[PDB]
Specification:
The structure is cut from a larger assembly and holds chains A (about 150 residues), B (about 140 residues), C (about 50 residues) and D (about 140 residues).
Chain A (H helix, E strand, L loop, with lengths): L12 E9 L3 H11 L4 H13 L4 E2 L19 E2 L2 H20 L8 E13 L2 E3 L5 E3 L2 E11 L2
Antiparallel strand pairs in A: 1-7, 2-3, 4-7, 5-6
Chain B lengths: L6 E4 L5 H13 L4 E4 L5 E3 L2 H13 L12 H10 L7 H7 L2 E3 L25 E3 H8 L6
Parallel strand pairs in B: 1-2, 2-4
Antiparallel strand pairs in B: 3-5
Helix pairs in contact in B: 1-3
Chain D lengths: L2 E3 L11 H13 L59 E5 L13 E5 L5 H12 L10 E3 L1
Parallel strand pairs in D: 2-3
Antiparallel strand pairs in D: 1-4
The chains are: A alpha+beta (about 150), B alpha/beta (about 140), C little secondary structure (about 50), D alpha+beta (about 140).
Bound molecules: chloride ion (7 copies), magnesium ion (MG) (14 copies), sodium ion (15 copies) and strontium ion (14 copies).
One chloride ion binds next to α1 of chain D.
The structure holds 3 RNA strands.
GO molecular function (chain D): DNA binding; nucleotide binding; rRNA binding; structural constituent of ribosome
Function (chain D): Binds to the 23S rRNA.
GO cellular component, one term (chain D): cytosolic large ribosomal subunit
RNA sequence: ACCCUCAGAAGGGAGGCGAAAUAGAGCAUGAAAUCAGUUGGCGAUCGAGCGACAGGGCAUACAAGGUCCCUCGACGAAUGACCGACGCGCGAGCGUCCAGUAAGACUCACGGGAAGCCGAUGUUCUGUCGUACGUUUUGAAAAACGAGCCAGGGAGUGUGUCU
RNA sequence: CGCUCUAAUUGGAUGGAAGUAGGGGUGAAAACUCCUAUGGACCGAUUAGUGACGAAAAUCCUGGCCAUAGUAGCAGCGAUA
RNA sequence: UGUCCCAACGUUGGGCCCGGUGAACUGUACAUUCCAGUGCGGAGUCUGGAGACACCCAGGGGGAAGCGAAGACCCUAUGGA
């Protein structure tokens, strides 16, 4: 697994991590990218709106075949990865929780750092025609989050 | 609309190719040039053969495109572009500091460059950019 | 006999594969193959005196 | 309060005029990189030099632009070949006894990296007292 | 261990041990391919063997390199004048003298200057040259053959006899 | 020039060896060397030997990995649930 | 008698958008191309011009002498059956 890739001052910072989550790594990059810089509370409201289908997540890199979305700003393609979003909600829940336990105002802290990393693949096999089988794997994702006082 | 040209050239009764060649040279040397009275510039030869050539350029083309100008305005500028490495930085800079005009939008009168003048009293086989344009189908707006 | 204890055979042309002896889908015997024989190894018969 | 290097750090060797001239030539002329052909085109191909052997090799055939091919003609002047840029001739040192026989006016010493701090400290104070510069000195806060 | 979080013997946070947890379980070290985040350079009007050599922009903690720039002067190879005077040519122009002079690459000395400043490194721009590599072939950029990428593996060896 | 192990001669290392990463110097070059970080236990030089000694390539071998792609499939069958 | 003149409208399952799951083929490199030319005479990459602001969605497949298979034809081998 990963280690925080950025330095953090414990006196004004709170951390959290997800480990080996079996979810789209591609969706995770998109989501991290979008919520970085937001406040914990804003990220949460944003992600809940994504799961509800009212706010799309811009897909700027892993966008092949993706339909355009009018609400996407400065870009065209977007989607509503609800699964990876719920995983990020757990992460934020943990982050804000730690934040408060330390005396900070969790919800109000800025998402200073958030990145997803592919830590591996849960391997699977899928039978195919002509007597052969091909890969059918699950991505394994770790994600780091650092909250910081305004 | 306003072009601080260091040089204003008068193409009236002047051999297009010879003026073009000098305007390119100056443009490459940093001069801002305005060619005036382009419709009165001239090209020697038999009108019928000259027109056949410019009409061929008009008819050439396809999806990728071969947009050839019909106005004396553009004919002349294209002529100049072919004497400049317009796809290189310096070449595009030179080409972009050169403008051609129908008539004379300035208050000064352009100067006649040496060696580019055509003596109408000694020549009958030549045509006018304006005449070529009209034949090409351009809308005589000059 | 190191690396030679295998009935590995090459499939020849036809399956878009190099003509390398294989057994159970594994390349074997030849020197360029992992687990294959040593091409010109140390030999006991050599006179070292 | 600040870092200082031990020994005769600023010392310069004394060279004949001809050696200073040739040392200056070597430094002015330099040489090509001499990296293997196409090392930049494929990660699996390192920069370490290899004679291009392809029958059709562009570099082998000496085509201008494909890089120079190693030839004796590129050798540096014998009188200066191998000298540190300072002008000193280097002497590899592993212990204090290696300092014996070294001319601090013509040679500078280089302590092998393997040597530890304890042995380096002794080597460094003994070299300074012998008038020998140490190319890779220890920096202490003084 | 204890505590917090969580649906939770999961995971996370804080904490404890140890010289080291970036030694926390296929748990010494931890390359490349490659992925995330990010720094420098370039970037939505512009062209393709991706570079080599020159020269500019921007970028650079220390250490392991310390040079570099401008006035002037000294030296000064090949080469080599302007101007002026005189004389020729229809003319473009040339001859003789000034003169193998002034100039002339490198190098050096005096005086002044630079420390991102000189080298170097990263990237980019300009100039010149440039259609991979290996093989097959009279002829390969080839619309001839090989390779997705990287690491590791991968081909003149032994006995006898002869020369 | 470089690699393995042997021998003689002779050195380095917990006051930090090998390796790795980034960087400085030398050599026409093979390649040598130093600095910093990591690492935490081994490492050289010279000389005479030794050889399962050097890779860009063989539809080469094995392992790992990227683009392909969040794409094809998860509809079609007289059993539409 | 929609085989045809000559095609139209409709039905069901796909196709398209969304959640989840999630492969393979293929990949020397570079690659926005077009017209001509040149070249081992069948060029996105050479030359000259022309055109060309970046990215994305859907499509039918013109080109990559497309991908797949060391041509089964033909010949050659002091080859096999
Ligand atoms: Cl993925
Ligand atoms: Cl057209
Ligand atoms: Cl151009
Ligand atoms: Cl006439
Ligand atoms: Cl030599
Ligand atoms: Cl000199
Ligand atoms: Cl041999
Ligand atoms: Mg789509
Ligand atoms: Mg079956
Ligand atoms: Mg074996
Ligand atoms: Mg390389
Ligand atoms: Mg480990
Ligand atoms: Mg080879
Ligand atoms: Mg042939
Ligand atoms: Mg010895
Ligand atoms: Mg190897
Ligand atoms: Mg596709
Ligand atoms: Mg039914
Ligand atoms: Mg065949
Ligand atoms: Mg037959
Ligand atoms: Mg037979
Ligand atoms: Na993208
Ligand atoms: Na939009
Ligand atoms: Na929008
Ligand atoms: Na003419
Ligand atoms: Na046209
Ligand atoms: Na066996
Ligand atoms: Na024996
Ligand atoms: Na530069
Ligand atoms: Na061949
Ligand atoms: Na070739
Ligand atoms: Na060809
Ligand atoms: Na593949
Ligand atoms: Na293959
Ligand atoms: Na019908
Ligand atoms: Na097609
Ligand atoms: Sr994309
Ligand atoms: Sr001229
Ligand atoms: Sr066959
Ligand atoms: Sr050391
Ligand atoms: Sr801890
Ligand atoms: Sr002289
Ligand atoms: Sr390899
Ligand atoms: Sr790394
Ligand atoms: Sr070998
Ligand atoms: Sr994949
Ligand atoms: Sr169904
Ligand atoms: Sr079916
Ligand atoms: Sr071109
Ligand atoms: Sr289609």
């Amino acid at each position: 697994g990963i280690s925080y890739s950025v330095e953090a001052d414990p006196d004004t910072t709170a951390k959290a991590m997800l480990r080996e989550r079996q979810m789209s790594f591609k969706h995770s990059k998109a989501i991290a990218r979008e919520i970085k810089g937001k406040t914990a509370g804003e990220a949460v409201d944003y992600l809940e709106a994504v799961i509800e289908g009212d706010q799309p997540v811009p897909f700027k890199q892993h966008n092949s075949g993706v339909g355009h979305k009018s609400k996407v700003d400065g870009w065209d393609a977007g989607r509503y990865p609800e699964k990876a979003s719920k995983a990020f909600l757990d992460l934020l829940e943990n982050a804000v929780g730690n934040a408060d336990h330390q005396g900070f105002d969790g919800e109000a802290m800025t998402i200073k750092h958030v990145a997803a990393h592919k830590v591996g693949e849960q391997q699977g096999r899928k039978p195919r025609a002509m007597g052969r089988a091909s890969a059918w794997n699950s991505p394994q994702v770790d994600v780091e989050l650092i909250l910081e006082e305004p | 609309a306003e072009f601080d040209a260091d040089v204003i050239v008068d193409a009236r009764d002047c051999i297009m190719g010879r003026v073009a060649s000098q305007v390119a040279e100056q443009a490459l040397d940093g001069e801002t040039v305005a060619v005036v009275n382009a419709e009165r510039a001239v090209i020697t030869g038999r009108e019928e053969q000259i027109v056949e050539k410019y009409e061929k350029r008009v008819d050439i083309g396809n999806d990728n495109g071969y947009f050839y100008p019909k106005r004396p305005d553009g004919i002349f500028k294209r002529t100049i572009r072919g004497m400049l490495p317009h796809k290189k930085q310096r070449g595009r800079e030179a080409f972009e500091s050169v403008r051609v005009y129908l008539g004379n939008p300035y208050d000064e009168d352009g100067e006649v460059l040496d060696g580019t003048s055509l003596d109408r009293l000694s020549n009958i086989k030549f045509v006018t950019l304006g005449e070529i344009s009209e034949t090409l189908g351009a809308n005589k707006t000059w | 006999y190191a690396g030679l204890r295998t009935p590995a055979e090459s499939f020849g042309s036809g399956r878009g594969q190099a003509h390398v002896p294989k057994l159970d889908g594994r390349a074997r015997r030849v020197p360029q193959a992992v687990k294959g024989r040593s091409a010109h190894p140390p030999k006991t018969e050599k006179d070292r005196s | 309060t600040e870092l200082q290097a031990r020994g005769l750090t600023e010392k310069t060797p004394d060279l004949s005029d001809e050696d200073a001239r040739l040392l200056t030539q070597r430094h002015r002329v330099g040489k090509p990189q001499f990296n293997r052909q196409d090392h930049h085109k494929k990660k699996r191909v390192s920069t370490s030099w290899r004679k291009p052997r392809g029958q059709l090799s562009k570099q082998r055939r000496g085509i201008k632009g494909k890089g120079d091919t190693v030839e004796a003609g590129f050798r540096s002047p014998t009188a200066v070949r191998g000298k540190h840029p300072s002008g000193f001739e280097e002497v590899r040192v592993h212990n204090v006894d290696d300092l014996e026989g070294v001319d601090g006016d013509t040679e500078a010493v280089r302590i092998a990296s393997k040597v530890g701090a304890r042995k380096r400290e002794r080597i460094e104070e003994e070299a300074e007292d012998a008038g020998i510069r140490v190319l890779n000195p220890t920096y202490v806060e003084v």
